[PDB]
């Protein structure tokens, strides 16, 4: 007689990670931060259609064809614990990206809290508002995941 | 705001249909028999291998290269 068991009862939070912005027809790394090891249960609601995407690593690809606001939903349940995040992103067709260096100091205090990172953004984007004199909304800045 | 609701609460018996023998190299058409609509969670233990397949549909196709016994779970 067989019985496989599995054991990860306490899930405490999830979080989606994706860029707020890319163009049509590019590849999306879309991440699922999660509390855990390979044993970990991901329902991926990439658009409108509502059958879900299973997987068990926190990072899927995707693409976009169609252009606007695309619902992106991730949910979690490893244990008999469920999580869910939802996330709208912006598909465009006319933009010009600039790739932008900041100062190495602030590393040392940078956490990548997505909220900080929001914030340091949306600075960035209004000092560029206010030494330009273009509009605001038409400028999005990004700061990344990565420890630089 | 979104949330995704999902409604089966109830679960009966399952039963996994699979051929008693068949010869190496060939392709099984393991059938996982359950109470269900196309929301279903399924997981397959195919050989040694700890990790499971993850399928919404009740059958899989999978060869052995090797022969002998196989735990299919
Ligand atoms: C919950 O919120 C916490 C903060 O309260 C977030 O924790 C932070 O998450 C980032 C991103 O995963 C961590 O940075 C990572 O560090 C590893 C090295 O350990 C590096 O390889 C990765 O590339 C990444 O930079 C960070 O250490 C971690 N902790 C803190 C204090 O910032 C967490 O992401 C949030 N997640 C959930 C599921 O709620
Ligand atoms: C539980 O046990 C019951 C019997 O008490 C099994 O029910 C029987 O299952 C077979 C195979 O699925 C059914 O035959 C099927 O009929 C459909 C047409 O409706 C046909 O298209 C299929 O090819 C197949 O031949 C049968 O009707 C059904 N009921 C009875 C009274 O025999 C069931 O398979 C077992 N399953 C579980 C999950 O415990
Ligand atoms: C997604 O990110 C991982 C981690 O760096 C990388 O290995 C992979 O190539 C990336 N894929 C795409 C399409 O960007
Ligand atoms: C988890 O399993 C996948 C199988 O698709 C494998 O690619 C990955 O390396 C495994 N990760 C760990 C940490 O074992
Ligand atoms: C498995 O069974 C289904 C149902 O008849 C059939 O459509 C499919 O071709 C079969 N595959 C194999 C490899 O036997
Ligand atoms: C269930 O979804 C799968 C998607 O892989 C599809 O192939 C299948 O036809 C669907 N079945 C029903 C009954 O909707």
Redesign the pocket.
Same mark, same amino acid.
């Given at each position: 007689a067989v019985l496989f068991v599995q054991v990860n009862s306490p899930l405490?939070? +999830?979080?989606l990670e994706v860029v707020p912005v890319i163009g049509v027809n590019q590849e999306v790394n879309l991440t699922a931060? @999660? @509390?855990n090891p390979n044993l970990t249960v991901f329902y991926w609601w990439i658009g409108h259609s509502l059958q879900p995407l299973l997987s068990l690593d926190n990072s899927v690809t995707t693409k976009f064809t169609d252009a606007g606001d695309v619902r992106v939903t991730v949910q979690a349940a490893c244990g008999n614990s469920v999580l869910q995040d939802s996330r709208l992103v912006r598909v465009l067709d006319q933009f010009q990206v600039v790739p932008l260096r900041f100062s190495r100091e602030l590393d040392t205090f940078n956490?990548?809290?997505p909220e900080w990172r929001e914030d340091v953004g949306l600075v960035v984007t209004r000092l560029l508002s206010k030494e330009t004199s273009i509009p605001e909304e038409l400028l999005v800045t990004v700061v990344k995941?990565? +420890?630089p």
């Open positions: 405490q939070a +999830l979080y931060v @999660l @509390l956490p990548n809290t995941p990565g +420890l």
